Amino acid sequence: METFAFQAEIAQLMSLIINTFYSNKEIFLRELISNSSDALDKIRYESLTDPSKLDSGKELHINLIPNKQDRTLTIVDTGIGMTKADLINNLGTIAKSGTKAFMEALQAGADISMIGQFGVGFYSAYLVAEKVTVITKHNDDEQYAWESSAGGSFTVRTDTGEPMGRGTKVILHLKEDQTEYLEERRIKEIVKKHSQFIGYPITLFVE
Numbered sequence: 386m387e388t389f390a391f392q393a394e395i396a397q398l399m400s401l402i403i404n405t406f407y408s409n410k411e412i413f414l415r416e417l418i419s420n421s422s423d424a425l426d427k428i429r430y431e432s433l434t435d436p437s438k439l440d441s442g443k444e445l446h447i448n449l450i451p452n453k454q455d456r457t458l459t460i461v462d463t464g465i466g467m468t469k470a471d472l473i474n475n476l477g478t479i480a481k482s483g484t485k486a487f488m489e490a491l492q493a494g495a496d497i498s499m500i501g502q503f504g505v506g507f508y509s510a511y512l513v514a515e516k517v518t519v520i521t522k523h524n525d526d527e528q529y530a531w532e533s534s535a536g537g538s539f540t541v542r543t544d545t546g547e548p549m550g551r552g553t554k555v556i557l558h559l560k561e562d563q564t565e566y567l568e569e570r571r572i573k574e575i576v577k578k579h580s581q582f583i584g585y586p587i588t589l590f591v592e
């Protein structure tokens with residue numbers, strides 16, 4: 386396990402998302418499904434030039450998996466996935482410019498719900514999660530686990546868990562007062578409201 390320090394801008398945004406009072410927390414699911422959708426679009430488009438890019442799996446889908454016992458909501462997609470370079474370096478650059486733009490837009494009067502327009506919608510996960518684990522597999526790299534409970538650091542390690550083939554699994558370790566996001570009726574309500582037109586099958590698993 387390797388430990389990394391978040392740069393100042395993202396660290397400040399993560400603290401804002403965790404601290405600030407905001408009742409409309411359900412938007413996290415739309416943002417994570419949007420990232421999954423974007424990742425799926427990416428592998429699909431690349432497969433048009435190189436069909437062997439789907440040898441790691443032809444299915445293009447999104448699964449929502451609540452687990453009341455573990456107090457986790459897991460989002461699984463078979464998108465392009467992220468390499469080690471993406472997790473540590475590339476997305477760190479994106480986190481900085483996206484945070485700066487978002488903070489500038491907020492200061493003018495923009496709302497937290499507009500986060501995805503700045504490319505940092507992933508961070509809305511901290512509205513409901515005390516810890517986020519990202520297990521990802523890109524065709525050009527090994528399976529990795531990125532994780533952060535905020536507090537200024539994140540970890541990256543090669544993942545030894547169940548092989549994913551290709552894609553990303555985001556495990557949301559929910560805050561104690563955010564268990565409504567494990568209820569079938571609640572998840573169904575959110576997907577219908579914000580993600581009804583996503584171009585991939587969204588399967589809501591039940592327990």
Ligand SMILES: O=C1c2ccccc2C2=C(c3nc4ccncc4[nH]3)CCCN12
Nearest residue numbers: 472473476477479480504505507519531
């Ligand atoms: O979806 C997104 C996303 C979307 C936008 C920006 C970052 C991310 C992002 C990650 C990330 N790597 C980082 C390394 C250093 N500073 C911050 C970082 N943020 C890793 C997990 C997934 N992720």
Ligand SMILES: Cc1onc(-c2ccc(O)cc2O)c1-c1ccccc1
Nearest residue numbers: 417420421423424464466467553555
């Ligand atoms: C590429 C890529 O490959 N997997 C993800 C991913 C990141 C987060 C997530 O919740 C689900 C995902 O599939 C992304 C991605 C990164 C930044 C913005 C949008 C998508």
